[PDB]
Design a binder for this molecule. Sequence first.
Ligand SMILES: *[C@@H]1O[C@H](CO)[C@@H](O[C@@H]2O[C@H](CO)[C@@H](O)[C@H](O)[C@H]2NC(C)=O)[C@H](O)[C@H]1NC(C)=O
Ligand SMILES: *[C@@H]1O[C@H](CO)[C@@H](O)[C@H](O)[C@H]1NC(C)=O
Ligand SMILES: *[C@@H]1O[C@H](CO)[C@@H](O)[C@H](O)[C@H]1NC(C)=O
Ligand SMILES: *[C@@H]1O[C@H](CO)[C@@H](O)[C@H](O)[C@H]1NC(C)=O
Ligand SMILES: *[C@@H]1O[C@H](CO)[C@@H](O)[C@H](O)[C@H]1NC(C)=O
Ligand SMILES: *[C@@H]1O[C@H](CO)[C@@H](O)[C@H](O)[C@H]1NC(C)=O
Ligand SMILES: [Zn+2]
Lengths: 195, 596
Amino acid sequence: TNLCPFGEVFNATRFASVYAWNRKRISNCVADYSVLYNSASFSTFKCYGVSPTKLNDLCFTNVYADSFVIRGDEVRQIAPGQTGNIADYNYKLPDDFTGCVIAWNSNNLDSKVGGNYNYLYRLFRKSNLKPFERDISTEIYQAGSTPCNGVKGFNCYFPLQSYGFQPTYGVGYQPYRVVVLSFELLHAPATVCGP
Amino acid sequence: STIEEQAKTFLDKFNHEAEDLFYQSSLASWNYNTNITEENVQNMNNAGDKWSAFLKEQSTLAQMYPLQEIQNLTVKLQLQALQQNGSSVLSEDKSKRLNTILNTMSTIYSTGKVCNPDNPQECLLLEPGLNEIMANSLDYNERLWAWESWRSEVGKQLRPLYEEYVVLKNEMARANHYEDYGDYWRGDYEVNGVDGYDYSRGQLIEDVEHTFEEIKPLYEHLHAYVRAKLMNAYPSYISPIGCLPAHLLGDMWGRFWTNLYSLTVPFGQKPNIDVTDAMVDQAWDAQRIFKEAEKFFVSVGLPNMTQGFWENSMLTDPGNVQKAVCHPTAWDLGKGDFRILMCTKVTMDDFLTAHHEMGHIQYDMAYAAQPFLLRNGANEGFHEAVGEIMSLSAATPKHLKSIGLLSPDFQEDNETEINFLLKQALTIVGTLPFTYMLEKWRWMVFKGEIPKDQWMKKWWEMKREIVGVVEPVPHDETYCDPASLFHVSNDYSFIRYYTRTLYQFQFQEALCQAAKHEGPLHKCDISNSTEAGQKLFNMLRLGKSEPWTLALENVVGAKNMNVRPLLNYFEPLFTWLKDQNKNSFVGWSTDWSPYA
Ligand SMILES: *[C@@H]1O[C@H](CO)[C@@H](O[C@@H]2O[C@H](CO)[C@@H](O)[C@H](O)[C@H]2NC(C)=O)[C@H](O)[C@H]1NC(C)=O
Ligand SMILES: *[C@@H]1O[C@H](CO)[C@@H](O)[C@H](O)[C@H]1NC(C)=O
Ligand SMILES: *[C@@H]1O[C@H](CO)[C@@H](O)[C@H](O)[C@H]1NC(C)=O
Ligand SMILES: *[C@@H]1O[C@H](CO)[C@@H](O)[C@H](O)[C@H]1NC(C)=O
Ligand SMILES: *[C@@H]1O[C@H](CO)[C@@H](O)[C@H](O)[C@H]1NC(C)=O
Ligand SMILES: *[C@@H]1O[C@H](CO)[C@@H](O)[C@H](O)[C@H]1NC(C)=O
Ligand SMILES: [Zn+2]
């Protein structure tokens, strides 16, 4: 009766920036998924392929928990086949995604009067992200044709931007903590069942 | 990557940076306006200085992308606006000289003091001292003293500064490839590159003068009726065929004739609709006033106020210690932060002001999804036009009876309609010749059509001819009477109050038609009409993204400013006025003056 360490993901003191999104591999444990979906503490709980309703009657080889912070209006981008700064440059879900996306408002934790500049996002990139790809590079983005020499300048921008979460922001600009659960199925042991 | 693609990426960086610096400056500004402390003045200045410095740097960077190589019009609009006037097209010395001139004129106006003869210590500022005289006094000599002393002691200081102000503004405008500073001001209405919706800077002069010609008959009869009533009060001071003396008009300049209502009310035995007593009888507070205003906008299909609006706004005067600036304002801080600052009292006037200011908020929320640089009214006259029409509907007896403030037994007769429309005309119609004439004088001065040695000669020739107002004391060229008004000495364009007045009745007529209103336009209430709300929202969400001619067409179905809805609104008064003036002379002679 090894319980899956979901508390370390959902109840972490600080979440990762979306450009440097965190991934926690969950293995060899018992997961009570129904506790999360029937807790009424999340504003977003949408599952794709799998069903949130009592489908903790299934076994999976590995479960991945991806967590990060974005603003409320960008939560809709954490879904298959979506476009935008987050989906294209920070965190991309595949078209055939099988899993759940969980989000809740964190204005009480990640906001600070004067601005909380701890959470960043990628504003520019040469191309879109592959599904489940992570880019933590800090290379100066070359918007023109003159080399940037590794510092900001004309047509040369630092690729990462900051949310600057203040408590008085509107809901669409308030911070939201997101947890993405991936359910993998290989021709393999299937070690995460979780009655 | 092409030049256009570079500009798109550059604007992408600017938007996120501008939104962050603009929110810090607005938050700092909000904290001072609600809590006046020395620490808050410095924080507001520090945040504001970073915001201005950021804009100056970004404007220079924007100028390295020439507009000639951009095809996407929405991109060109944002680029052009940030290209603004540049980061000073003049030299540093001339910009420094101009900024000191602007500050000195502002300081002279806001600190200008006038002292009564024989007591050099009993002195009055314009606000509240001189304004109280011009708005409440019925004594001819007291009003004349305030009117002349303000222009002879404060206006004369502004004369040399304004002359140098004209020279430097024209140099800045001509180096920006405008004809003059007036042509620069008219650029707010310019539209290029949109087939069927274009608008030239010179077309504004033609349209303002063309529509003003149709206003003249209404203003002439209002002028004649007002002159007859004033002649009864001041028989020895007013000619039956002459212009109205400038110091007997209700405020320092005659900008509004509002305070002439007591002496000109048609039926002085029928009281005004004043629901202030009913509000106090039902124990209304400020939150109830703004809750009712919110219900009004929801009834037409507009969204309710955000949770942050109720939590962060200041809807009451803070207290006895913590001080605040009580001028009612609607704040768009960005990042979804919308607030109203207002020291609300339980009165009918503040009940209507809440509807005006929340109208600003609804406009701000509607175009929040637009890019940062397009988050504004379609032109300079759209925002207040939207705000004004909210108080039009909210003040009608029909609306005041549906919310329980006006008793159902109360019925309106045509005498109260004439009283109300006359009061409306004193404010709305009375200012139109004043506004047009003032801006025409400034346009001609910037154009160079008025020499310096004829500024005041031309100023009062146009007052007599266009406004039917005559100076009570001759003024030579040491005077700068136009600069005695806030907008002239503080470098604000003035035609916006003319175009906005015509927009608001165009808006109201279109919305009331969509609301299927029956009867005179002035009795209409757009409440409960989602058809009217949808038609308005189709324009509100546009912001500055589309030409104002197209945004206007979204509401009213016409591409240009039109004066017919204004005349339609005041038709019951116009018919009544023409009957009243059958025994009076209509029009004015320009040669009569009170100083003979
Ligand atoms: C002008 O540029 C904007 C953005 O650079 C274009 O709008 C984009 O249109 C694409 C689809 O073609 C959307 O996926 C983007 O989300 C849009 N972005 C924005 C900011 O609107 C717009 O279509 C261009 N206009 C013209 C006439 O070319
Ligand atoms: C987080 O903490 C709360 C309160 O202790 C608890 O109810 C919840 O189950 C925790 N989250 C997880 C994923 O266990
Ligand atoms: C007013 O401002 C001071 C700092 O200038 C601050 O300490 C105080 O808490 C503020 N009061 C209110 C009511 O906001
Ligand atoms: C505004 O209306 C929405 C329904 O569209 C509701 O969920 C929300 O609680 C309302 N907020 C306020 C402050 O009335
Ligand atoms: C608006 O509609 C309500 C019913 O939904 C009605 O009671 C009220 O009198 C109406 N008010 C106006 C001004 O039409
Ligand atoms: C009000 O109506 C009556 C009845 O027709 C009319 O005699 C009177 O002149 C009207 N008052 C006006 C038009 O001011
Ligand atoms: Zn306003």
